[PDB]
Protein backbone atom coordinates (compact mmCIF):
# COMPACT_ATOMS: atom_id res chain seq x y z
CA UNK A 1 0.00 0.00 0.00
CA UNK A 2 0.63 3.72 0.27
CA UNK A 3 1.73 5.55 3.28
CA UNK A 4 1.85 9.31 4.50
CA UNK A 5 4.77 11.00 5.55
CA UNK A 6 4.53 14.99 7.03
CA UNK A 7 7.37 16.52 7.67
CA UNK A 8 7.39 18.68 10.71
CA UNK A 9 7.79 21.80 8.66
CA UNK A 10 4.37 20.95 7.24
CA UNK A 11 2.86 20.38 10.81
CA UNK A 12 4.19 23.45 12.64
CA UNK A 13 3.14 25.56 9.35
CA UNK A 14 -0.90 24.58 10.02
CA UNK A 15 -0.56 25.63 13.42
CA UNK A 16 0.40 28.93 12.78
CA UNK A 17 -2.27 29.73 10.35
CA UNK A 18 -4.63 29.29 12.92
CA UNK A 19 -3.98 31.72 15.59
CA UNK A 20 -2.59 34.32 13.31
CA UNK A 21 -5.93 34.30 11.44
CA UNK A 22 -8.03 34.76 14.69
CA UNK A 23 -9.80 31.44 13.74
CA UNK A 24 -12.81 30.10 15.99
CA UNK A 25 -15.22 27.08 16.00
CA UNK A 26 -16.89 28.30 13.12
CA UNK A 27 -14.24 28.51 10.77
CA UNK A 28 -11.67 25.93 9.57
CA UNK A 29 -8.66 26.81 7.58
CA UNK A 30 -7.82 25.52 4.09
CA UNK A 31 -4.47 24.30 2.81
CA UNK A 32 -2.46 23.06 -0.15
CA UNK A 33 0.62 20.08 0.93
CA UNK A 34 2.58 20.12 -1.84
CA UNK A 35 4.84 16.95 -2.31
CA UNK A 36 5.82 13.88 -4.28
CA UNK A 37 2.63 11.31 -4.49
CA UNK A 38 3.89 9.34 -7.75
CA UNK A 39 5.96 6.83 -5.23
CA UNK A 40 4.46 5.07 -2.54
CA UNK A 41 6.05 6.92 0.07
CA UNK A 42 3.80 10.12 0.14
CA UNK A 43 6.11 13.14 1.47
CA UNK A 44 4.68 16.34 1.78
CA UNK A 45 7.89 19.34 2.09
CA UNK A 46 5.42 22.31 1.48
CA UNK A 47 2.17 23.63 2.97
CA UNK A 48 0.45 26.73 2.58
CA UNK A 49 -3.31 28.31 3.58
CA UNK A 50 -5.65 29.80 1.27
CA UNK A 51 -8.66 32.76 1.98
CA UNK A 52 -10.91 30.01 2.72
CA UNK A 53 -14.58 31.12 3.81
CA UNK A 54 -16.96 28.50 5.98
CA UNK A 55 -20.35 29.00 6.81
CA UNK A 56 -22.38 26.71 8.78
CA UNK A 57 -26.01 27.08 7.74
CA UNK A 58 -25.36 25.94 3.64
CA UNK A 59 -22.58 23.70 3.75
CA UNK A 60 -22.53 23.92 -0.37
CA UNK A 61 -21.31 27.35 0.54
CA UNK A 62 -17.52 28.04 0.61
CA UNK A 63 -15.48 30.88 -0.65
CA UNK A 64 -12.34 29.19 -2.42
CA UNK A 65 -9.82 31.25 -5.01
CA UNK A 66 -8.72 29.06 -7.89
CA UNK A 67 -6.01 32.07 -9.38
CA UNK A 68 -4.33 32.20 -6.02
CA UNK A 69 -3.78 28.26 -6.28
CA UNK A 70 -2.37 27.70 -9.17
CA UNK A 71 -0.14 31.24 -9.14
CA UNK A 72 1.47 29.99 -5.73
CA UNK A 73 1.83 26.37 -7.01
CA UNK A 74 3.79 28.08 -9.78
CA UNK A 75 6.01 30.04 -8.36
CA UNK A 76 7.11 28.39 -5.69
CA UNK A 77 7.99 25.89 -7.97
CA UNK A 78 11.52 28.06 -8.14
CA UNK A 79 12.60 26.63 -4.89
CA UNK A 80 12.33 23.23 -5.06
CA UNK A 81 10.84 21.27 -8.73
CA UNK A 82 9.63 18.01 -6.27
CA UNK A 83 6.96 19.98 -5.05
CA UNK A 84 3.44 19.49 -7.18
CA UNK A 85 -0.18 18.93 -6.21
CA UNK A 86 -0.63 16.30 -4.42
CA UNK A 87 -3.86 17.59 -2.30
CA UNK A 88 -4.65 19.87 0.11
CA UNK A 89 -5.37 19.87 4.20
CA UNK A 90 -7.76 21.54 6.28
CA UNK A 91 -8.58 22.26 10.46
CA UNK A 92 -11.50 21.79 12.16
CA UNK A 93 -12.14 18.34 14.28
CA UNK A 94 -14.68 16.48 12.98
CA UNK A 95 -15.57 15.95 8.86
CA UNK A 96 -18.59 17.68 8.13
CA UNK A 97 -20.85 18.30 5.16
CA UNK A 98 -18.94 20.81 3.78
CA UNK A 99 -15.90 18.89 3.65
CA UNK A 100 -17.27 16.30 1.37
CA UNK A 101 -18.69 18.45 -1.45
CA UNK A 102 -15.25 20.34 -1.91
CA UNK A 103 -13.21 17.07 -2.58
CA UNK A 104 -13.90 17.14 -6.16
CA UNK A 105 -12.17 20.68 -6.58
CA UNK A 106 -8.30 19.80 -6.33
CA UNK A 107 -8.90 16.49 -8.68
CA UNK A 108 -9.24 18.62 -11.89
CA UNK A 109 -5.19 19.43 -11.64
CA UNK A 110 -4.76 15.99 -9.69
CA UNK A 111 -3.25 13.30 -11.41
CA UNK A 112 -2.85 10.72 -9.03
CA UNK A 113 -5.40 9.98 -6.16
CA UNK A 114 -5.36 13.06 -4.10
CA UNK A 115 -5.00 13.71 -0.78
CA UNK A 116 -6.25 14.55 2.45
CA UNK A 117 -5.07 15.80 5.60
CA UNK A 118 -7.11 17.01 8.89
CA UNK A 119 -4.66 19.52 11.22
CA UNK A 120 -6.59 19.55 15.08
CA UNK A 121 -4.94 22.22 16.75
CA UNK A 122 -6.34 20.63 20.61
CA UNK A 123 -5.20 17.33 19.62
CA UNK A 124 -7.90 15.65 21.87
CA UNK A 125 -7.15 12.48 22.82
CA UNK A 126 -5.05 9.42 21.65
CA UNK A 127 -2.19 10.27 19.45
CA UNK A 128 -2.21 11.07 15.43
CA UNK A 129 -2.77 14.96 16.16
CA UNK A 130 -2.70 15.19 12.09
CA UNK A 131 -4.83 12.48 10.17
CA UNK A 132 -4.46 11.57 6.30
CA UNK A 133 -7.13 9.96 4.22
CA UNK A 134 -7.52 9.21 0.64
CA UNK A 135 -10.26 10.34 -1.17
CA UNK A 136 -11.29 7.34 -4.36
CA UNK A 137 -14.62 5.98 -5.40
CA UNK A 138 -16.02 3.12 -7.10
CA UNK A 139 -19.93 6.65 -3.69
CA UNK A 140 -16.91 8.04 -1.94
CA UNK A 141 -14.99 5.79 0.33
CA UNK A 142 -11.94 7.05 2.73
CA UNK A 143 -9.28 5.03 3.64
CA UNK A 144 -6.62 5.90 6.42
CA UNK A 145 -3.22 5.82 5.66
CA UNK A 146 -0.32 5.29 7.99
CA UNK A 147 0.55 8.42 9.64
CA UNK A 148 4.39 8.39 10.06
CA UNK A 149 6.67 11.83 10.38
CA UNK A 150 10.39 11.66 8.77
CA UNK A 151 12.44 15.03 7.93
CA UNK A 152 15.78 15.62 7.17
CA UNK A 153 19.25 15.60 8.93
CA UNK A 154 19.31 19.46 10.09
CA UNK A 155 15.69 19.64 10.53
CA UNK A 156 15.40 16.54 13.02
CA UNK A 157 18.58 18.10 14.79
CA UNK A 158 17.54 21.36 14.89
CA UNK A 159 14.26 20.41 17.07
CA UNK A 160 16.53 18.89 19.80
CA UNK A 161 18.16 22.22 20.15
CA UNK A 162 15.00 23.82 21.33
CA UNK A 163 13.93 21.49 22.96
CA UNK A 164 17.25 21.29 25.49
CA UNK A 165 6.93 4.16 28.65
CA UNK A 166 5.27 1.16 30.14
CA UNK A 167 2.82 2.99 32.12
CA UNK A 168 1.32 5.31 28.85
CA UNK A 169 1.84 1.98 26.84
CA UNK A 170 -0.74 0.37 29.07
CA UNK A 171 -3.15 3.68 29.80
CA UNK A 172 -3.85 4.15 25.84
CA UNK A 173 -3.95 0.07 25.38
CA UNK A 174 -6.72 -0.22 28.19
CA UNK A 175 -8.76 2.91 26.54
CA UNK A 176 -8.57 0.93 22.85
CA UNK A 177 -11.13 -1.69 24.41
CA UNK A 178 -13.62 1.40 26.56
CA UNK A 179 -13.41 3.55 22.61
CA UNK A 180 -14.41 0.33 20.78
CA UNK A 181 -17.21 -0.70 23.21
CA UNK A 182 -19.11 2.45 22.82
CA UNK A 183 -18.70 2.37 18.95
CA UNK A 184 -20.39 -0.75 18.85
CA UNK A 185 -23.46 0.08 21.19
CA UNK A 186 -23.87 3.38 19.51
CA UNK A 187 -24.06 1.56 16.27
CA UNK A 188 -26.30 -1.43 17.58
CA UNK A 189 -29.25 1.14 18.23
CA UNK A 190 -28.31 3.23 15.06
CA UNK A 191 -28.92 0.33 12.78
CA UNK A 192 -32.78 -0.75 14.40
CA UNK A 193 -22.99 -5.78 10.58
CA UNK A 194 -20.44 -4.49 7.54
CA UNK A 195 -18.72 -2.28 10.11
CA UNK A 196 -18.96 -4.35 12.68
CA UNK A 197 -17.63 -7.39 10.56
CA UNK A 198 -14.21 -5.46 10.26
CA UNK A 199 -13.86 -4.84 13.83
CA UNK A 200 -15.02 -8.75 14.67
CA UNK A 201 -12.14 -9.58 12.17
CA UNK A 202 -9.65 -7.72 14.53
CA UNK A 203 -11.16 -8.95 17.69
CA UNK A 204 -11.33 -12.79 17.01
CA UNK A 205 -7.76 -13.12 15.75
CA UNK A 206 -4.42 -18.37 28.06
CA UNK A 207 -6.56 -18.90 24.37
CA UNK A 208 -4.84 -19.26 21.43
CA UNK A 209 -1.41 -19.42 23.52
CA UNK A 210 -2.17 -22.66 25.62
CA UNK A 211 -0.03 -24.63 23.45
CA UNK A 212 3.06 -22.04 23.34
CA UNK A 213 2.37 -21.29 27.02
CA UNK A 214 4.79 -24.38 28.35
CA UNK A 215 7.72 -22.99 25.22
CA UNK A 216 7.27 -19.34 26.54
CA UNK A 217 7.93 -20.57 30.47
CA UNK A 218 11.34 -22.07 29.28
CA UNK A 219 12.34 -19.08 27.39
CA UNK A 220 11.70 -16.91 30.14
CA UNK A 221 14.01 -19.20 32.24
CA UNK A 222 17.14 -19.09 29.80
CA UNK A 223 16.57 -14.71 29.95
CA UNK A 224 17.01 -15.18 33.35
CA UNK A 225 20.22 -16.84 33.19
CA UNK A 226 21.59 -13.76 31.50
CA UNK A 227 20.17 -11.40 34.02
CA UNK A 228 21.39 -13.76 36.46
CA UNK A 229 24.98 -13.22 35.32
CA UNK A 230 25.07 -9.62 34.45
CA UNK A 231 23.91 -9.12 38.24
CA UNK A 232 27.00 -11.09 39.54
CA UNK A 233 29.05 -8.82 37.54
CA UNK A 234 27.28 -6.21 39.27
CA UNK A 235 27.71 -7.52 42.48
CA UNK A 236 31.27 -7.71 41.99
CA UNK A 237 31.89 -4.45 41.36
CA UNK A 238 30.42 -3.03 44.95
CA UNK A 239 32.81 -5.13 46.84
CA UNK A 240 35.40 -4.04 44.76
CA UNK A 241 33.83 -0.31 45.60
CA UNK A 242 34.40 -1.20 49.46
CA UNK A 243 37.62 -1.83 49.77
CA UNK A 244 38.85 1.10 47.45
CA UNK A 245 36.54 2.88 49.58
CA UNK A 246 39.26 1.76 52.39
CA UNK A 247 42.18 2.44 50.58
CA UNK A 248 41.30 6.43 50.42
CA UNK A 249 40.24 6.20 54.26
CA UNK A 250 44.06 4.40 55.09
CA UNK A 251 45.64 7.52 53.53
CA UNK A 252 43.19 9.78 55.28
CA UNK A 253 44.21 8.48 59.18
CA UNK A 254 47.63 8.30 57.84
CA UNK A 255 48.10 11.87 56.47
CA UNK B 1 -2.74 -37.66 69.32
CA UNK B 2 -0.54 -40.70 67.67
CA UNK B 3 -3.19 -42.16 65.76
CA UNK B 4 -4.04 -38.30 64.83
CA UNK B 5 -0.60 -38.16 63.42
CA UNK B 6 -0.43 -41.52 61.69
CA UNK B 7 -3.42 -40.34 59.90
CA UNK B 8 -0.49 -37.24 58.47
CA UNK B 9 1.29 -39.82 57.32
CA UNK B 10 -1.27 -42.11 55.63
CA UNK B 11 -2.62 -39.44 53.80
CA UNK B 12 0.72 -38.83 51.53
CA UNK B 13 1.86 -42.20 52.19
CA UNK B 14 -0.96 -44.40 50.69
CA UNK B 15 -2.75 -43.68 47.78
CA UNK B 16 -5.42 -46.58 48.05
CA UNK B 17 -5.67 -48.83 51.25
CA UNK B 18 -8.52 -50.87 52.12
CA UNK B 19 -10.85 -50.56 55.78
CA UNK B 20 -9.39 -53.69 57.57
CA UNK B 21 -5.98 -52.41 56.70
CA UNK B 22 -6.78 -49.08 58.52
CA UNK B 23 -8.42 -51.05 61.52
CA UNK B 24 -4.90 -52.93 61.97
CA UNK B 25 -2.52 -50.72 61.37
CA UNK B 26 -3.96 -48.04 64.18
CA UNK B 27 -4.64 -50.77 66.30
CA UNK B 28 -8.90 -50.07 66.23
CA UNK B 29 -11.85 -52.66 67.88
CA UNK B 30 -14.11 -51.68 65.61
CA UNK B 31 -14.53 -51.42 61.58
CA UNK B 32 -17.35 -48.99 61.86
CA UNK B 33 -15.63 -47.09 64.05
CA UNK B 34 -13.08 -46.92 61.84
CA UNK B 35 -15.13 -45.12 59.15
CA UNK B 36 -16.06 -42.73 62.06
CA UNK B 37 -12.53 -41.28 62.33
CA UNK B 38 -12.55 -40.91 58.39
CA UNK B 39 -15.17 -38.51 57.79
CA UNK B 40 -13.88 -36.30 61.02
CA UNK B 41 -10.62 -36.36 58.66
CA UNK B 42 -12.62 -35.83 55.37
CA UNK B 43 -11.50 -39.76 53.78
CA UNK B 44 -13.52 -40.60 51.02
CA UNK B 45 -15.02 -44.13 51.26
CA UNK B 46 -15.65 -46.36 48.45
CA UNK B 47 -16.39 -49.86 48.38
CA UNK B 48 -13.74 -52.28 50.54
CA UNK B 49 -10.98 -49.20 49.90
CA UNK B 50 -10.36 -45.86 51.00
CA UNK B 51 -8.73 -43.16 48.82
CA UNK B 52 -7.64 -39.39 49.41
CA UNK B 53 -8.12 -36.83 47.30
CA UNK B 54 -6.79 -34.33 49.97
CA UNK B 55 -3.28 -34.47 49.39
CA UNK B 56 -3.78 -31.02 47.82
CA UNK B 57 -3.52 -27.82 50.50
CA UNK B 58 -5.00 -24.56 50.57
CA UNK B 59 -6.35 -21.85 52.96
CA UNK B 60 -4.43 -21.99 56.12
CA UNK B 61 -5.00 -18.74 57.66
CA UNK B 62 -4.35 -15.91 55.29
CA UNK B 63 -1.52 -15.27 52.59
CA UNK B 64 -1.02 -12.47 50.06
CA UNK B 65 1.35 -12.44 47.06
CA UNK B 66 3.55 -15.33 49.05
CA UNK B 67 3.83 -19.22 48.93
CA UNK B 68 2.43 -19.94 45.34
CA UNK B 69 -0.30 -17.17 44.96
CA UNK B 70 -3.26 -17.38 42.47
CA UNK B 71 -4.22 -14.31 40.65
CA UNK B 72 -1.22 -12.29 41.11
CA UNK B 73 1.04 -14.56 39.77
CA UNK B 74 1.56 -12.89 36.31
CA UNK B 75 2.47 -9.20 38.14
CA UNK B 76 4.87 -10.68 40.68
CA UNK B 77 7.18 -12.18 38.26
CA UNK B 78 7.18 -8.38 36.69
CA UNK B 79 7.05 -6.66 39.85
CA UNK B 80 10.41 -8.80 40.86
CA UNK B 81 12.05 -7.18 37.62
CA UNK B 82 10.84 -3.39 38.48
CA UNK B 83 12.51 -3.58 42.16
CA UNK B 84 15.95 -4.10 40.97
CA UNK B 85 15.53 -1.16 39.18
CA UNK B 86 14.59 1.20 41.72
CA UNK B 87 17.61 -0.06 43.93
CA UNK B 88 19.90 1.20 41.31
CA UNK B 89 18.06 4.55 40.93
CA UNK C 1 -26.04 -0.23 -3.05
CA UNK C 2 -27.42 1.76 -5.72
CA UNK C 3 -30.71 4.45 -4.76
CA UNK C 4 -30.96 6.74 -7.94
CA UNK C 5 -30.23 3.99 -10.75
CA UNK C 6 -31.41 0.66 -11.93
CA UNK C 7 -35.18 0.84 -12.09
CA UNK C 8 -36.84 -2.55 -10.95
CA UNK C 9 -40.45 -3.37 -10.74
CA UNK C 10 -41.76 -6.40 -8.57
CA UNK C 11 -41.08 -8.72 -12.01
CA UNK C 12 -38.05 -8.36 -12.78
CA UNK C 13 -37.51 -8.43 -8.38
CA UNK C 14 -38.67 -12.15 -8.70
CA UNK C 15 -36.20 -12.73 -11.41
CA UNK C 16 -33.11 -11.27 -10.57
CA UNK C 17 -33.99 -13.00 -6.66
CA UNK C 18 -33.93 -16.75 -8.61
CA UNK C 19 -30.30 -16.11 -9.68
CA UNK C 20 -29.61 -14.95 -6.36
CA UNK C 21 -31.30 -17.34 -4.78
CA UNK C 22 -29.74 -20.52 -6.56
CA UNK C 23 -26.14 -19.29 -6.44
CA UNK C 24 -26.25 -19.98 -2.97
CA UNK C 25 -27.90 -23.44 -3.00
CA UNK C 26 -24.15 -24.52 -3.87
CA UNK C 27 -22.03 -21.89 -2.64
CA UNK C 28 -20.17 -22.32 0.18
CA UNK C 29 -18.79 -18.93 0.28
CA UNK C 30 -19.52 -15.58 1.95
CA UNK C 31 -22.07 -16.32 4.55
CA UNK C 32 -25.20 -17.90 3.34
CA UNK C 33 -29.20 -17.22 2.48
CA UNK C 34 -29.58 -14.91 5.16
CA UNK C 35 -27.05 -11.99 2.60
CA UNK C 36 -30.32 -12.54 0.79
CA UNK C 37 -32.34 -11.83 3.10
CA UNK C 38 -30.58 -8.72 4.66
CA UNK C 39 -31.00 -6.86 1.18
CA UNK C 40 -34.67 -5.65 1.12
CA UNK C 41 -35.15 -8.97 -1.48
CA UNK C 42 -37.91 -11.33 0.27
CA UNK C 43 -40.04 -8.63 1.56
CA UNK C 44 -40.58 -7.67 -2.26
CA UNK C 45 -41.15 -11.20 -3.51
CA UNK C 46 -43.76 -14.09 -2.54
CA UNK C 47 -43.41 -16.17 0.12
CA UNK C 48 -44.28 -19.12 -1.66
CA UNK C 49 -43.60 -21.21 -5.06
CA UNK C 50 -40.13 -22.77 -4.24
CA UNK C 51 -39.11 -18.49 -3.43
CA UNK C 52 -39.46 -19.97 0.90
CA UNK C 53 -36.34 -21.72 0.34
CA UNK C 54 -34.12 -19.05 2.22
CA UNK C 55 -36.76 -19.53 5.64
CA UNK C 56 -36.61 -23.18 5.49
CA UNK C 57 -32.59 -22.98 4.75
CA UNK C 58 -32.19 -21.11 7.55
CA UNK C 59 -33.32 -23.39 10.19
CA UNK C 60 -32.20 -26.28 8.20
CA UNK C 61 -28.32 -25.10 9.27
CA UNK C 62 -29.17 -25.01 12.98
CA UNK C 63 -32.08 -28.08 13.42
CA UNK C 64 -29.56 -29.88 10.99
CA UNK C 65 -33.74 -31.55 9.68
CA UNK C 66 -33.09 -32.73 5.13
CA UNK C 67 -36.90 -33.67 5.22
CA UNK C 68 -38.12 -30.38 5.81
CA UNK C 69 -36.66 -29.02 2.74
CA UNK C 70 -36.63 -32.09 0.33
CA UNK C 71 -40.48 -32.51 1.11
CA UNK C 72 -41.34 -29.26 -0.25
CA UNK C 73 -38.84 -29.03 -3.54
CA UNK C 74 -39.11 -30.81 -6.41
CA UNK C 75 -37.14 -33.48 -8.34
CA UNK C 76 -34.95 -31.03 -10.29
CA UNK C 77 -32.47 -29.66 -7.50
CA UNK C 78 -32.94 -33.11 -4.97
CA UNK C 79 -31.24 -35.42 -7.83
CA UNK C 80 -27.71 -33.60 -7.68
CA UNK C 81 -26.24 -35.60 -4.11
CA UNK C 82 -24.00 -32.66 -4.44
CA UNK C 83 -26.73 -30.06 -2.84
CA UNK C 84 -27.12 -32.25 0.44
CA UNK C 85 -23.56 -32.23 0.72
CA UNK C 86 -22.89 -28.55 0.59
CA UNK C 87 -26.27 -28.35 3.34
CA UNK C 88 -23.85 -30.28 5.47
CA UNK C 89 -20.92 -27.54 5.65
CA UNK C 90 -22.90 -24.49 6.75
CA UNK C 91 -24.56 -26.14 8.76
CA UNK C 92 -21.06 -27.32 11.24
CA UNK C 93 -19.41 -23.88 10.07
CA UNK C 94 -21.79 -21.55 12.85
CA UNK C 95 -20.38 -23.80 15.62
CA UNK C 96 -16.54 -24.33 14.25
CA UNK C 97 -16.75 -20.39 14.11
CA UNK C 98 -17.83 -20.11 18.02
CA UNK C 99 -14.57 -22.17 19.00
CA UNK C 100 -12.55 -19.01 19.39
CA UNK C 101 -14.64 -16.06 20.67
CA UNK C 102 -18.40 -15.24 19.81
CA UNK C 103 -20.61 -17.38 22.37
CA UNK C 104 -18.60 -19.22 24.86
CA UNK C 105 -17.12 -17.98 27.63
CA UNK C 106 -14.02 -19.18 28.74
CA UNK C 107 -12.84 -18.73 25.32
CA UNK C 108 -10.91 -21.41 24.92
CA UNK C 109 -10.83 -23.50 21.30
CA UNK C 110 -11.22 -26.91 21.92
CA UNK C 111 -13.36 -29.38 20.29
CA UNK C 112 -14.00 -33.36 20.73
CA UNK C 113 -15.28 -35.98 17.97
CA UNK C 114 -18.73 -36.42 21.09
CA UNK C 115 -19.35 -32.79 20.78
CA UNK C 116 -18.93 -32.06 17.16
CA UNK C 117 -21.00 -35.42 16.23
CA UNK C 118 -24.25 -34.12 18.08
CA UNK C 119 -24.43 -30.93 16.46
CA UNK C 120 -23.56 -31.92 13.49
CA UNK C 121 -26.01 -35.07 13.48
CA UNK C 122 -23.39 -37.33 11.52
CA UNK C 123 -21.67 -40.21 13.07
CA UNK C 124 -17.64 -39.98 14.25
CA UNK C 125 -16.89 -41.71 10.85
CA UNK C 126 -18.54 -39.06 8.44
CA UNK C 127 -17.37 -35.66 10.73
CA UNK C 128 -13.76 -36.37 10.13
CA UNK C 129 -14.30 -36.63 6.34
CA UNK C 130 -16.37 -33.34 6.73
CA UNK C 131 -13.81 -31.28 8.13
CA UNK C 132 -11.00 -32.36 5.70
CA UNK C 133 -13.30 -31.40 2.60
CA UNK C 134 -14.24 -28.19 4.61
CA UNK C 135 -10.61 -27.13 4.80
CA UNK C 136 -9.81 -28.83 1.24
CA UNK C 137 -11.93 -26.14 -0.29
CA UNK C 138 -10.21 -23.03 1.02
CA UNK C 139 -13.46 -22.22 3.75
CA UNK C 140 -11.02 -23.57 6.78
CA UNK C 141 -7.79 -24.34 7.80
CA UNK C 142 -6.11 -26.04 11.07
CA UNK C 143 -4.99 -29.38 12.06
CA UNK C 144 -7.02 -32.51 13.44
CA UNK C 145 -5.83 -34.42 16.17
CA UNK C 146 -7.23 -37.89 16.19
CA UNK C 147 -5.57 -39.34 19.16
CA UNK C 148 -6.23 -37.19 21.72
CA UNK C 149 -9.73 -36.01 20.27
CA UNK C 150 -8.81 -32.46 19.50
CA UNK C 151 -10.11 -30.11 16.22
CA UNK C 152 -8.04 -27.01 15.84
CA UNK C 153 -9.36 -24.72 13.38
CA UNK C 154 -7.91 -21.81 12.62
CA UNK C 155 -10.61 -18.70 11.81
CA UNK C 156 -11.00 -17.91 8.17
CA UNK C 157 -15.10 -17.30 7.34
CA UNK C 158 -15.94 -14.05 8.61
CA UNK C 159 -19.50 -13.90 10.31
CA UNK C 160 -22.00 -10.73 9.95
CA UNK C 161 -23.76 -11.77 13.09
CA UNK C 162 -22.90 -9.34 16.73
CA UNK C 163 -24.40 -8.91 20.53
CA UNK C 164 -22.39 -11.48 21.98
CA UNK C 165 -19.20 -9.96 21.97
CA UNK C 166 -20.02 -7.32 23.90
CA UNK C 167 -20.15 -9.09 27.15
CA UNK C 168 -16.98 -11.45 26.77
CA UNK C 169 -14.97 -8.23 24.98
CA UNK C 170 -15.61 -6.58 28.86
CA UNK C 171 -13.84 -9.55 29.99
CA UNK C 172 -10.49 -8.40 28.80
CA UNK C 173 -11.33 -4.90 29.75
CA UNK C 174 -11.95 -5.67 33.88
CA UNK C 175 -9.31 -8.32 33.89
CA UNK C 176 -6.91 -5.98 32.30
CA UNK C 177 -8.40 -3.34 34.33
CA UNK C 178 -7.54 -4.60 37.96
CA UNK C 179 -3.85 -4.51 36.80
CA UNK C 180 -4.00 -0.52 36.16
CA UNK C 181 -5.03 0.02 39.48
CA UNK C 182 -2.60 -2.92 41.45
CA UNK C 183 0.29 -3.46 39.42
CA UNK C 184 -0.18 0.05 37.23
CA UNK C 185 -0.33 2.33 40.14
CA UNK C 186 2.44 -0.21 41.64
CA UNK C 187 5.38 1.35 39.74
CA UNK C 188 3.77 4.95 39.38
CA UNK C 189 3.93 5.00 42.85
CA UNK C 190 7.37 3.96 43.01
Known amino acids: ?255 | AIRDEIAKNTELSYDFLPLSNIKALLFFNNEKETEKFALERNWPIVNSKVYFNNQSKEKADYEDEMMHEEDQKTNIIEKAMDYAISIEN | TLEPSTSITLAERQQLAYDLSISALLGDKIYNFGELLHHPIMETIVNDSNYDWLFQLLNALTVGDFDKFDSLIKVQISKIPILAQHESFLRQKICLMTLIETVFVKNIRMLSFEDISKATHLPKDNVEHLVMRAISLGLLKGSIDQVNELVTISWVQPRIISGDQITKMKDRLVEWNDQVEKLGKKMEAR
Open chain 1, 1 to 255: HEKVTIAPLVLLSALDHYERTQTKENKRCVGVILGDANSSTIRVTNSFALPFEEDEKNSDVWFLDHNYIENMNEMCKKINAKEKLIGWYHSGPKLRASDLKINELFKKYTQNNPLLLIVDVKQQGVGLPTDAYVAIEQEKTFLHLPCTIEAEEAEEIGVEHLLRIRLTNQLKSLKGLQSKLKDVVEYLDKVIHTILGKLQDVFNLNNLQKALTVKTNDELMVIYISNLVRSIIAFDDLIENKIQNKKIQEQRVKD
